[PDB]
Amino acid sequence: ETSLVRDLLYVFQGIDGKFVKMCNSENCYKVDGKVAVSKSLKDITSKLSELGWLHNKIKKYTDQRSLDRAFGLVGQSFCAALHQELKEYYRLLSVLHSQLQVESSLTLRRLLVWTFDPKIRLKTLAALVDHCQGRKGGELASAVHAYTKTGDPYMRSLVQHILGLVAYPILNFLYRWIYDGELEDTYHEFFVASDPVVKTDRLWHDKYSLRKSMIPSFMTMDQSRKVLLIGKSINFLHQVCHDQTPASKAMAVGKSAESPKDAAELFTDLENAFQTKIDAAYFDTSKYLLDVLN
Amino acid sequence: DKFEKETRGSLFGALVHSRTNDMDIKLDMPPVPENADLSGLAIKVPQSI
Amino acid sequence: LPSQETCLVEDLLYILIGVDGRYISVQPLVGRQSRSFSVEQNLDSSVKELVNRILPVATNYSTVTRFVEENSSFEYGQVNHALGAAMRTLGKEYMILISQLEHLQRQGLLSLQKLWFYIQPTLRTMEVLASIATSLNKGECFGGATLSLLHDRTFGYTGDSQAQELCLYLTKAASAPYFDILERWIYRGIINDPYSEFMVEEHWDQRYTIVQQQIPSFLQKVADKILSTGKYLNVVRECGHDVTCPDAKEITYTLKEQAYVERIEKAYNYASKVL
Amino acid sequence: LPSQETCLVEDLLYILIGVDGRYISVQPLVGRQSRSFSVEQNLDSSVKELVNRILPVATNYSTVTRFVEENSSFEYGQVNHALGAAMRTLGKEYMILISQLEHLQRQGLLSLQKLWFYIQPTLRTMEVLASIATSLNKGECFGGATLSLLHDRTFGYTGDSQAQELCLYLTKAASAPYFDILERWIYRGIINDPYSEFMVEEHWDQRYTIVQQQIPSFLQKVADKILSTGKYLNVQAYVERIEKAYNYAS
């Protein structure tokens, strides 16, 4: 009885438990390995099958990153998001281990429906990583936002919260380069790239190629066209020492406020509220650009 | 932090009853209602939230 | 020998889930609505006819959840993915009764008659989820004609309390996706969905593709008014202009299926004037 | 089978201190840089989950052993014993969490993965501090060169807020000695370097060296502006501190 009850808690925490199957690949599957066979034991192992494997998909990705400095932006921010749902997976597993060992009951039909709200949650989360196994920040942002286009508002809120957090370096790349010109991308995982061509004294020369093949699905193309000149017009005032935010100083306070404000909430990617004040930056830097010559 | 706390109360959706941050809750359904002994069991529809 | 009558109870609680028994076979046969479960006879002919009596009640549920919970996940943004997902929710709660019955089976506290009196309202709930799943495969419906069918359900049929009760919730929860983008077309003049569900898909202001295959969720009278709005909303696209004039018809939300006519009329004269 | 499992719950707490265990036998290979554990054999196949409690604690001890090799052989007060002290402080706050579990372990509660929710914020915390400590010690980094590594960690660890909070806190806890030495140079005009604490090493015709064994976290260009504040006094906004020093002097 109790042996297969304790096996499936241990596959939830990793692989094995009391018997060997040892699936670190494949589709994970449970072999009871007993002389006591019944036909309901066959249906319980197929219950286990997509619970343990879909847990293993998160482990395959965050150990594929092996937390590193190469892709230490977006690529590993995505592993960061998946680490917040890693824990919660362990949590329904700790209240079931609290029932088992003294604080008793085994797994039953009760526990059988309890897990099925994780079950559908891990089909979304396993599908979210299957979508995008590339290692670029621009095409990660087009992949997980396209899995928000689908129906079902139970998983729309679930992915919306992953999507705010994949986006937490991405909008952190955005507004500093807009107000001042700041960069940290040496890998080119910022969808706006830099230095394909040699860097010479400005005269309006190239140092930004935004790449018409990798734009985040939450941004629109005619806006990425506007921000390209905003990055160029401020970096072109590196031939004067005024590197400040152009026109109003009320834009510079915003980036500093915003990075805590996004963390604190439910990890929501604002992609039409953000679009309002990046219009007002295009409007700022063009009268400023003519007023330093005036 | 809002998203983390909300998930955690329901224990990754493995609770439907009460919000708890204890990991010492016993997962059990309730005994049959008294309104469910006069007509038999009936599934509650979550209307008007 | 008397023990075996309780043993077939415990085998029954797995039929309701949709899975294998310990002495009652499950056949995941081709076709839906009716798959046959083969009950292995045991001595005492009376308790075998009795179980055979309760057997179709578990059967008609077990087919209909199965294909529609996977089919829904394959949907592109359409209202049938919000619909199939709401069924799965009501399907969790059916299984609460399965596990509450198994809680009373620690030693026998129930009989086959005591089970039936309990699933007596859930038999009227399951038979009205049964016709939904068949009607949307007959048409091979997409998102505009799905809602056309479900409309007549929430404004027809009576016989149980619990049947109409479920059927208010799920039909508003299929219409509610539709409403969220509805305010997006009737004010902003954009679609978010991959296939729009309205009278027209997107493109002087007659340059449209009229799909009748995807039509509005109600009677045609609001549908004529959804076309007229999109003409004002085309003019601003035709030569650029303030498209941020509507928001004072968005301080209040729409959200009606008992008077969709009023909110569409208020979405019409508001769009006529700002032009 | 439940009884053997709750024994190794009690033996893990002793291991996590960084010391001898009981039936969990520990052997340093080359001076606590790697330590092989030899777990018992049991009739439970939760042996895999045992081997998954080894690797957290792998990185535990190797922070501490690496940072004391610096600080006891030269007595660094510029960066390495500073970071040794920030890390001993995260070590006290580690060990009180070890005491928080031992209080609980004299009741029936904790078992294998009951503890692993305490292990999880701390795992992210110690794995980055250890991948930090490997590169400082064995990199051969002292003075500014250490700061320059910690600076690259702030960049690399934007993903994950918990990861970001540690290298923020380490890179400022490593600079609070090293900034003070440059401050008296640019404010007062006195410097003494006994361990070569700052880049400028004396010996007007005294030199204003900017060395690359203490390469700066900041631009090489703005380090010149440090240098030359001190020239005329010698016989985020931490770069403006130097510029407002620099306008005073010339």
mmCIF file with all atom_site columns, N, CA and C in Angstrom, chain A residues 226-285:
data_model
loop_
_atom_site.group_PDB
_atom_site.id
_atom_site.type_symbol
_atom_site.label_atom_id
_atom_site.label_alt_id
_atom_site.label_comp_id
_atom_site.label_asym_id
_atom_site.label_entity_id
_atom_site.label_seq_id
_atom_site.pdbx_PDB_ins_code
_atom_site.Cartn_x
_atom_site.Cartn_y
_atom_site.Cartn_z
_atom_site.occupancy
_atom_site.B_iso_or_equiv
_atom_site.pdbx_formal_charge
_atom_site.auth_seq_id
_atom_site.auth_comp_id
_atom_site.auth_asym_id
_atom_site.auth_atom_id
_atom_site.pdbx_PDB_model_num
ATOM 1   N N  . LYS A 1 226 ? 10.384 54.847 -33.617 1.00 0.00 ? 226 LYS A N  1
ATOM 2   C CA . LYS A 1 226 ? 10.510 56.131 -32.997 1.00 0.00 ? 226 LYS A CA 1
ATOM 3   C C  . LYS A 1 226 ? 11.610 56.197 -32.005 1.00 0.00 ? 226 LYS A C  1
ATOM 4   N N  . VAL A 1 227 ? 11.794 55.064 -31.284 1.00 0.00 ? 227 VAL A N  1
ATOM 5   C CA . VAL A 1 227 ? 12.816 55.011 -30.197 1.00 0.00 ? 227 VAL A CA 1
ATOM 6   C C  . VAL A 1 227 ? 14.251 54.913 -30.676 1.00 0.00 ? 227 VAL A C  1
ATOM 7   N N  . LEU A 1 228 ? 14.381 54.540 -31.965 1.00 0.00 ? 228 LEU A N  1
ATOM 8   C CA . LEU A 1 228 ? 15.667 54.366 -32.622 1.00 0.00 ? 228 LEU A CA 1
ATOM 9   C C  . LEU A 1 228 ? 16.334 55.700 -32.777 1.00 0.00 ? 228 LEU A C  1
ATOM 10  N N  . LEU A 1 229 ? 15.619 56.781 -33.122 1.00 0.00 ? 229 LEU A N  1
ATOM 11  C CA . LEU A 1 229 ? 16.098 58.146 -33.288 1.00 0.00 ? 229 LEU A CA 1
ATOM 12  C C  . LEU A 1 229 ? 16.341 58.736 -31.899 1.00 0.00 ? 229 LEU A C  1
ATOM 13  N N  . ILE A 1 230 ? 15.620 58.315 -30.800 1.00 0.00 ? 230 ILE A N  1
ATOM 14  C CA . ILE A 1 230 ? 15.664 58.862 -29.517 1.00 0.00 ? 230 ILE A CA 1
ATOM 15  C C  . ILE A 1 230 ? 17.018 58.506 -28.884 1.00 0.00 ? 230 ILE A C  1
ATOM 16  N N  . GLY A 1 231 ? 17.515 57.259 -29.182 1.00 0.00 ? 231 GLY A N  1
ATOM 17  C CA . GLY A 1 231 ? 18.766 56.657 -28.724 1.00 0.00 ? 231 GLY A CA 1
ATOM 18  C C  . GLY A 1 231 ? 19.928 57.331 -29.456 1.00 0.00 ? 231 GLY A C  1
ATOM 19  N N  . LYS A 1 232 ? 19.706 57.708 -30.731 1.00 0.00 ? 232 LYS A N  1
ATOM 20  C CA . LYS A 1 232 ? 20.678 58.319 -31.612 1.00 0.00 ? 232 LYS A CA 1
ATOM 21  C C  . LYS A 1 232 ? 20.831 59.784 -31.323 1.00 0.00 ? 232 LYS A C  1
ATOM 22  N N  . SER A 1 233 ? 19.750 60.514 -30.926 1.00 0.00 ? 233 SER A N  1
ATOM 23  C CA . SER A 1 233 ? 19.748 61.939 -30.749 1.00 0.00 ? 233 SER A CA 1
ATOM 24  C C  . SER A 1 233 ? 20.346 62.336 -29.483 1.00 0.00 ? 233 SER A C  1
ATOM 25  N N  . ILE A 1 234 ? 20.264 61.512 -28.434 1.00 0.00 ? 234 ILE A N  1
ATOM 26  C CA . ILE A 1 234 ? 20.927 61.691 -27.162 1.00 0.00 ? 234 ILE A CA 1
ATOM 27  C C  . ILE A 1 234 ? 22.394 61.306 -27.096 1.00 0.00 ? 234 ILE A C  1
ATOM 28  N N  . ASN A 1 235 ? 22.859 60.337 -27.905 1.00 0.00 ? 235 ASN A N  1
ATOM 29  C CA . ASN A 1 235 ? 24.203 59.799 -27.965 1.00 0.00 ? 235 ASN A CA 1
ATOM 30  C C  . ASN A 1 235 ? 25.000 60.656 -28.841 1.00 0.00 ? 235 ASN A C  1
ATOM 31  N N  . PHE A 1 236 ? 24.292 61.484 -29.686 1.00 0.00 ? 236 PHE A N  1
ATOM 32  C CA . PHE A 1 236 ? 24.829 62.473 -30.524 1.00 0.00 ? 236 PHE A CA 1
ATOM 33  C C  . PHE A 1 236 ? 25.065 63.752 -29.751 1.00 0.00 ? 236 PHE A C  1
ATOM 34  N N  . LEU A 1 237 ? 24.498 63.865 -28.548 1.00 0.00 ? 237 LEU A N  1
ATOM 35  C CA . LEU A 1 237 ? 24.865 64.850 -27.494 1.00 0.00 ? 237 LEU A CA 1
ATOM 36  C C  . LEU A 1 237 ? 25.760 64.141 -26.449 1.00 0.00 ? 237 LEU A C  1
ATOM 37  N N  . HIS A 1 238 ? 26.783 63.507 -27.019 1.00 0.00 ? 238 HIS A N  1
ATOM 38  C CA . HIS A 1 238 ? 27.963 63.056 -26.292 1.00 0.00 ? 238 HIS A CA 1
ATOM 39  C C  . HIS A 1 238 ? 29.132 63.834 -26.911 1.00 0.00 ? 238 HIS A C  1
ATOM 40  N N  . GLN A 1 239 ? 28.823 64.757 -27.911 1.00 0.00 ? 239 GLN A N  1
ATOM 41  C CA . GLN A 1 239 ? 29.767 65.681 -28.468 1.00 0.00 ? 239 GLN A CA 1
ATOM 42  C C  . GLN A 1 239 ? 29.544 67.035 -27.703 1.00 0.00 ? 239 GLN A C  1
ATOM 43  N N  . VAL A 1 240 ? 28.727 66.981 -26.655 1.00 0.00 ? 240 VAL A N  1
ATOM 44  C CA . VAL A 1 240 ? 28.652 67.989 -25.637 1.00 0.00 ? 240 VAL A CA 1
ATOM 45  C C  . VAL A 1 240 ? 28.536 67.044 -24.371 1.00 0.00 ? 240 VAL A C  1
ATOM 46  N N  . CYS A 1 241 ? 28.634 67.627 -23.136 1.00 0.00 ? 241 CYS A N  1
ATOM 47  C CA . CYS A 1 241 ? 28.808 66.841 -21.997 1.00 0.00 ? 241 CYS A CA 1
ATOM 48  C C  . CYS A 1 241 ? 27.498 66.603 -21.381 1.00 0.00 ? 241 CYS A C  1
ATOM 49  N N  . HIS A 1 242 ? 26.436 67.287 -21.929 1.00 0.00 ? 242 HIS A N  1
ATOM 50  C CA . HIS A 1 242 ? 25.104 67.168 -21.441 1.00 0.00 ? 242 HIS A CA 1
ATOM 51  C C  . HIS A 1 242 ? 24.518 65.875 -21.947 1.00 0.00 ? 242 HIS A C  1
ATOM 52  N N  . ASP A 1 243 ? 24.597 64.952 -20.970 1.00 0.00 ? 243 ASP A N  1
ATOM 53  C CA . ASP A 1 243 ? 24.117 63.588 -21.121 1.00 0.00 ? 243 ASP A CA 1
ATOM 54  C C  . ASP A 1 243 ? 22.810 63.291 -20.436 1.00 0.00 ? 243 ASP A C  1
ATOM 55  N N  . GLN A 1 244 ? 22.271 64.388 -19.810 1.00 0.00 ? 244 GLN A N  1
ATOM 56  C CA . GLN A 1 244 ? 21.018 64.337 -19.036 1.00 0.00 ? 244 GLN A CA 1
ATOM 57  C C  . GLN A 1 244 ? 19.808 63.941 -19.880 1.00 0.00 ? 244 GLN A C  1
ATOM 58  N N  . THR A 1 245 ? 18.681 63.692 -19.151 1.00 0.00 ? 245 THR A N  1
ATOM 59  C CA . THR A 1 245 ? 17.401 63.424 -19.741 1.00 0.00 ? 245 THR A CA 1
ATOM 60  C C  . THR A 1 245 ? 16.925 64.751 -20.433 1.00 0.00 ? 245 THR A C  1
ATOM 61  N N  . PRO A 1 246 ? 16.415 64.671 -21.647 1.00 0.00 ? 246 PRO A N  1
ATOM 62  C CA . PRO A 1 246 ? 16.244 65.886 -22.402 1.00 0.00 ? 246 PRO A CA 1
ATOM 63  C C  . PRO A 1 246 ? 14.964 66.581 -21.955 1.00 0.00 ? 246 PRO A C  1
ATOM 64  N N  . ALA A 1 247 ? 14.961 67.916 -22.026 1.00 0.00 ? 247 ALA A N  1
ATOM 65  C CA . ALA A 1 247 ? 13.822 68.715 -21.670 1.00 0.00 ? 247 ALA A CA 1
ATOM 66  C C  . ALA A 1 247 ? 13.390 68.544 -20.195 1.00 0.00 ? 247 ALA A C  1
ATOM 67  N N  . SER A 1 248 ? 12.281 67.850 -19.868 1.00 0.00 ? 248 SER A N  1
ATOM 68  C CA . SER A 1 248 ? 11.820 67.656 -18.550 1.00 0.00 ? 248 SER A CA 1
ATOM 69  C C  . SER A 1 248 ? 12.676 66.642 -17.857 1.00 0.00 ? 248 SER A C  1
ATOM 70  N N  . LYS A 1 249 ? 13.036 66.926 -16.580 1.00 0.00 ? 249 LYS A N  1
ATOM 71  C CA . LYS A 1 249 ? 13.699 66.075 -15.634 1.00 0.00 ? 249 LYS A CA 1
ATOM 72  C C  . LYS A 1 249 ? 12.753 65.161 -14.890 1.00 0.00 ? 249 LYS A C  1
ATOM 73  N N  . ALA A 1 250 ? 11.429 65.278 -15.163 1.00 0.00 ? 250 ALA A N  1
ATOM 74  C CA . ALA A 1 250 ? 10.369 64.494 -14.629 1.00 0.00 ? 250 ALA A CA 1
ATOM 75  C C  . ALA A 1 250 ? 10.388 63.088 -15.278 1.00 0.00 ? 250 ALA A C  1
ATOM 76  N N  . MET A 1 251 ? 11.133 62.826 -16.431 1.00 0.00 ? 251 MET A N  1
ATOM 77  C CA . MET A 1 251 ? 11.318 61.547 -17.067 1.00 0.00 ? 251 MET A CA 1
ATOM 78  C C  . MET A 1 251 ? 12.385 60.755 -16.327 1.00 0.00 ? 251 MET A C  1
ATOM 79  N N  . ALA A 1 252 ? 13.367 61.387 -15.596 1.00 0.00 ? 252 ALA A N  1
ATOM 80  C CA . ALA A 1 252 ? 14.517 60.662 -15.118 1.00 0.00 ? 252 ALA A CA 1
ATOM 81  C C  . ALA A 1 252 ? 14.125 59.971 -13.832 1.00 0.00 ? 252 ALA A C  1
ATOM 82  N N  . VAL A 1 253 ? 13.125 60.593 -13.063 1.00 0.00 ? 253 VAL A N  1
ATOM 83  C CA . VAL A 1 253 ? 12.632 60.065 -11.849 1.00 0.00 ? 253 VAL A CA 1
ATOM 84  C C  . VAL A 1 253 ? 11.883 58.813 -12.151 1.00 0.00 ? 253 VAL A C  1
ATOM 85  N N  . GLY A 1 254 ? 11.169 58.728 -13.290 1.00 0.00 ? 254 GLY A N  1
ATOM 86  C CA . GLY A 1 254 ? 10.341 57.618 -13.603 1.00 0.00 ? 254 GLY A CA 1
ATOM 87  C C  . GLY A 1 254 ? 11.004 56.239 -13.632 1.00 0.00 ? 254 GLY A C  1
ATOM 88  N N  . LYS A 1 255 ? 12.302 56.028 -14.148 1.00 0.00 ? 255 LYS A N  1
ATOM 89  C CA . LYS A 1 255 ? 12.907 54.759 -14.324 1.00 0.00 ? 255 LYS A CA 1
ATOM 90  C C  . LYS A 1 255 ? 13.202 54.220 -12.957 1.00 0.00 ? 255 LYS A C  1
ATOM 91  N N  . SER A 1 256 ? 13.709 55.079 -12.042 1.00 0.00 ? 256 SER A N  1
ATOM 92  C CA . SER A 1 256 ? 14.049 54.741 -10.700 1.00 0.00 ? 256 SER A CA 1
ATOM 93  C C  . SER A 1 256 ? 12.880 54.258 -9.845  1.00 0.00 ? 256 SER A C  1
ATOM 94  N N  . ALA A 1 257 ? 11.727 54.971 -9.977  1.00 0.00 ? 257 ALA A N  1
ATOM 95  C CA . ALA A 1 257 ? 10.491 54.543 -9.352  1.00 0.00 ? 257 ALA A CA 1
ATOM 96  C C  . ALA A 1 257 ? 9.945  53.256 -9.823  1.00 0.00 ? 257 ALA A C  1
ATOM 97  N N  . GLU A 1 258 ? 9.988  53.071 -11.191 1.00 0.00 ? 258 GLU A N  1
ATOM 98  C CA . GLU A 1 258 ? 9.336  52.011 -11.961 1.00 0.00 ? 258 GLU A CA 1
ATOM 99  C C  . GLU A 1 258 ? 9.894  50.642 -11.678 1.00 0.00 ? 258 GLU A C  1
ATOM 100 N N  . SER A 1 259 ? 11.249 50.404 -11.484 1.00 0.00 ? 259 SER A N  1
ATOM 101 C CA . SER A 1 259 ? 11.829 49.096 -11.336 1.00 0.00 ? 259 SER A CA 1
ATOM 102 C C  . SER A 1 259 ? 11.335 48.507 -10.057 1.00 0.00 ? 259 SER A C  1
ATOM 103 N N  . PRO A 1 260 ? 11.254 49.129 -8.904  1.00 0.00 ? 260 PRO A N  1
ATOM 104 C CA . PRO A 1 260 ? 10.506 48.662 -7.659  1.00 0.00 ? 260 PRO A CA 1
ATOM 105 C C  . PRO A 1 260 ? 8.986  48.482 -7.845  1.00 0.00 ? 260 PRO A C  1
ATOM 106 N N  . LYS A 1 261 ? 8.288  49.400 -8.520  1.00 0.00 ? 261 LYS A N  1
ATOM 107 C CA . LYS A 1 261 ? 6.873  49.330 -8.789  1.00 0.00 ? 261 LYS A CA 1
ATOM 108 C C  . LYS A 1 261 ? 6.369  48.107 -9.558  1.00 0.00 ? 261 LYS A C  1
ATOM 109 N N  . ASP A 1 262 ? 7.128  47.712 -10.611 1.00 0.00 ? 262 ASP A N  1
ATOM 110 C CA . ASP A 1 262 ? 6.905  46.446 -11.234 1.00 0.00 ? 262 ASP A CA 1
ATOM 111 C C  . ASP A 1 262 ? 7.148  45.176 -10.414 1.00 0.00 ? 262 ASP A C  1
ATOM 112 N N  . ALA A 1 263 ? 8.261  45.165 -9.513  1.00 0.00 ? 263 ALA A N  1
ATOM 113 C CA . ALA A 1 263 ? 8.521  44.033 -8.644  1.00 0.00 ? 263 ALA A CA 1
ATOM 114 C C  . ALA A 1 263 ? 7.507  43.620 -7.624  1.00 0.00 ? 263 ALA A C  1
ATOM 115 N N  . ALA A 1 264 ? 6.884  44.672 -7.093  1.00 0.00 ? 264 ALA A N  1
ATOM 116 C CA . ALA A 1 264 ? 6.022  44.694 -5.948  1.00 0.00 ? 264 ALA A CA 1
ATOM 117 C C  . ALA A 1 264 ? 4.663  44.263 -6.202  1.00 0.00 ? 264 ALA A C  1
ATOM 118 N N  . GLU A 1 265 ? 4.265  44.414 -7.489  1.00 0.00 ? 265 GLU A N  1
ATOM 119 C CA . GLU A 1 265 ? 2.907  44.105 -7.910  1.00 0.00 ? 265 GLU A CA 1
ATOM 120 C C  . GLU A 1 265 ? 2.900  42.661 -8.315  1.00 0.00 ? 265 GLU A C  1
ATOM 121 N N  . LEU A 1 266 ? 2.037  42.354 -9.290  1.00 0.00 ? 266 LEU A N  1
ATOM 122 C CA . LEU A 1 266 ? 1.828  40.931 -9.567  1.00 0.00 ? 266 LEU A CA 1
ATOM 123 C C  . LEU A 1 266 ? 2.602  40.611 -10.793 1.00 0.00 ? 266 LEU A C  1
ATOM 124 N N  . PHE A 1 267 ? 3.625  41.415 -11.252 1.00 0.00 ? 267 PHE A N  1
ATOM 125 C CA . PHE A 1 267 ? 4.451  41.127 -12.408 1.00 0.00 ? 267 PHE A CA 1
ATOM 126 C C  . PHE A 1 267 ? 3.689  41.229 -13.695 1.00 0.00 ? 267 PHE A C  1
ATOM 127 N N  . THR A 1 268 ? 3.259  42.499 -13.961 1.00 0.00 ? 268 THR A N  1
ATOM 128 C CA . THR A 1 268 ? 2.380  42.757 -15.014 1.00 0.00 ? 268 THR A CA 1
ATOM 129 C C  . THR A 1 268 ? 3.254  43.536 -15.982 1.00 0.00 ? 268 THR A C  1
ATOM 130 N N  . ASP A 1 269 ? 3.197  43.169 -17.261 1.00 0.00 ? 269 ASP A N  1
ATOM 131 C CA . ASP A 1 269 ? 3.896  43.885 -18.280 1.00 0.00 ? 269 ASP A CA 1
ATOM 132 C C  . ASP A 1 269 ? 2.951  44.926 -18.812 1.00 0.00 ? 269 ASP A C  1
ATOM 133 N N  . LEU A 1 270 ? 3.278  46.195 -18.634 1.00 0.00 ? 270 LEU A N  1
ATOM 134 C CA . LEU A 1 270 ? 2.483  47.308 -19.006 1.00 0.00 ? 270 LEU A CA 1
ATOM 135 C C  . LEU A 1 270 ? 3.047  47.547 -20.363 1.00 0.00 ? 270 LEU A C  1
ATOM 136 N N  . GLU A 1 271 ? 2.251  47.440 -21.421 1.00 0.00 ? 271 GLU A N  1
ATOM 137 C CA . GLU A 1 271 ? 2.637  47.560 -22.842 1.00 0.00 ? 271 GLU A CA 1
ATOM 138 C C  . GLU A 1 271 ? 1.618  48.482 -23.665 1.00 0.00 ? 271 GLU A C  1
ATOM 139 N N  . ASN A 1 272 ? 0.988  49.483 -22.985 1.00 0.00 ? 272 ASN A N  1
ATOM 140 C CA . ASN A 1 272 ? 0.175  50.474 -23.575 1.00 0.00 ? 272 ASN A CA 1
ATOM 141 C C  . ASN A 1 272 ? 0.008  51.606 -22.644 1.00 0.00 ? 272 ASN A C  1
ATOM 142 N N  . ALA A 1 273 ? 0.545  51.410 -21.411 1.00 0.00 ? 273 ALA A N  1
ATOM 143 C CA . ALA A 1 273 ? 0.744  52.508 -20.496 1.00 0.00 ? 273 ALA A CA 1
ATOM 144 C C  . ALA A 1 273 ? 2.069  53.052 -20.599 1.00 0.00 ? 273 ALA A C  1
ATOM 145 N N  . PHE A 1 274 ? 3.062  52.159 -20.961 1.00 0.00 ? 274 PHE A N  1
ATOM 146 C CA . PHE A 1 274 ? 4.449  52.513 -21.210 1.00 0.00 ? 274 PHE A CA 1
ATOM 147 C C  . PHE A 1 274 ? 4.622  53.301 -22.422 1.00 0.00 ? 274 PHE A C  1
ATOM 148 N N  . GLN A 1 275 ? 3.743  53.110 -23.384 1.00 0.00 ? 275 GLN A N  1
ATOM 149 C CA . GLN A 1 275 ? 3.825  53.635 -24.771 1.00 0.00 ? 275 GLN A CA 1
ATOM 150 C C  . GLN A 1 275 ? 3.465  55.150 -24.742 1.00 0.00 ? 275 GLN A C  1
ATOM 151 N N  . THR A 1 276 ? 3.026  55.674 -23.600 1.00 0.00 ? 276 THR A N  1
ATOM 152 C CA . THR A 1 276 ? 2.481  57.049 -23.559 1.00 0.00 ? 276 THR A CA 1
ATOM 153 C C  . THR A 1 276 ? 3.647  57.971 -23.369 1.00 0.00 ? 276 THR A C  1
ATOM 154 N N  . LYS A 1 277 ? 4.592  57.750 -22.391 1.00 0.00 ? 277 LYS A N  1
ATOM 155 C CA . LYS A 1 277 ? 5.633  58.578 -22.048 1.00 0.00 ? 277 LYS A CA 1
ATOM 156 C C  . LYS A 1 277 ? 6.933  58.439 -22.862 1.00 0.00 ? 277 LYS A C  1
ATOM 157 N N  . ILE A 1 278 ? 7.026  57.448 -23.755 1.00 0.00 ? 278 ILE A N  1
ATOM 158 C CA . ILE A 1 278 ? 8.054  57.245 -24.729 1.00 0.00 ? 278 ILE A CA 1
ATOM 159 C C  . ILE A 1 278 ? 7.698  57.999 -25.991 1.00 0.00 ? 278 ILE A C  1
ATOM 160 N N  . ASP A 1 279 ? 6.430  58.352 -26.187 1.00 0.00 ? 279 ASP A N  1
ATOM 161 C CA . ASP A 1 279 ? 6.004  59.405 -27.147 1.00 0.00 ? 279 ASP A CA 1
ATOM 162 C C  . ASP A 1 279 ? 6.507  60.708 -26.737 1.00 0.00 ? 279 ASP A C  1
ATOM 163 N N  . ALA A 1 280 ? 6.355  61.078 -25.413 1.00 0.00 ? 280 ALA A N  1
ATOM 164 C CA . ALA A 1 280 ? 6.782  62.328 -24.843 1.00 0.00 ? 280 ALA A CA 1
ATOM 165 C C  . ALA A 1 280 ? 8.257  62.573 -24.710 1.00 0.00 ? 280 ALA A C  1
ATOM 166 N N  . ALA A 1 281 ? 9.001  61.487 -24.941 1.00 0.00 ? 281 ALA A N  1
ATOM 167 C CA . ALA A 1 281 ? 10.469 61.566 -25.018 1.00 0.00 ? 281 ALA A CA 1
ATOM 168 C C  . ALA A 1 281 ? 11.021 61.903 -26.335 1.00 0.00 ? 281 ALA A C  1
ATOM 169 N N  . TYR A 1 282 ? 10.301 61.431 -27.451 1.00 0.00 ? 282 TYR A N  1
ATOM 170 C CA . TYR A 1 282 ? 10.498 61.724 -28.828 1.00 0.00 ? 282 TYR A CA 1
ATOM 171 C C  . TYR A 1 282 ? 10.238 63.209 -28.948 1.00 0.00 ? 282 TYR A C  1
ATOM 172 N N  . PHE A 1 283 ? 9.236  63.762 -28.226 1.00 0.00 ? 283 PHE A N  1
ATOM 173 C CA . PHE A 1 283 ? 8.866  65.164 -28.289 1.00 0.00 ? 283 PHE A CA 1
ATOM 174 C C  . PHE A 1 283 ? 9.806  66.047 -27.557 1.00 0.00 ? 283 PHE A C  1
ATOM 175 N N  . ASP A 1 284 ? 10.401 65.507 -26.463 1.00 0.00 ? 284 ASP A N  1
ATOM 176 C CA . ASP A 1 284 ? 11.411 66.223 -25.649 1.00 0.00 ? 284 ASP A CA 1
ATOM 177 C C  . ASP A 1 284 ? 12.704 66.472 -26.409 1.00 0.00 ? 284 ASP A C  1
ATOM 178 N N  . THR A 1 285 ? 13.333 65.456 -27.006 1.00 0.00 ? 285 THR A N  1
ATOM 179 C CA . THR A 1 285 ? 14.756 65.414 -27.377 1.00 0.00 ? 285 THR A CA 1
ATOM 180 C C  . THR A 1 285 ? 14.999 66.154 -28.711 1.00 0.00 ? 285 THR A C  1
#
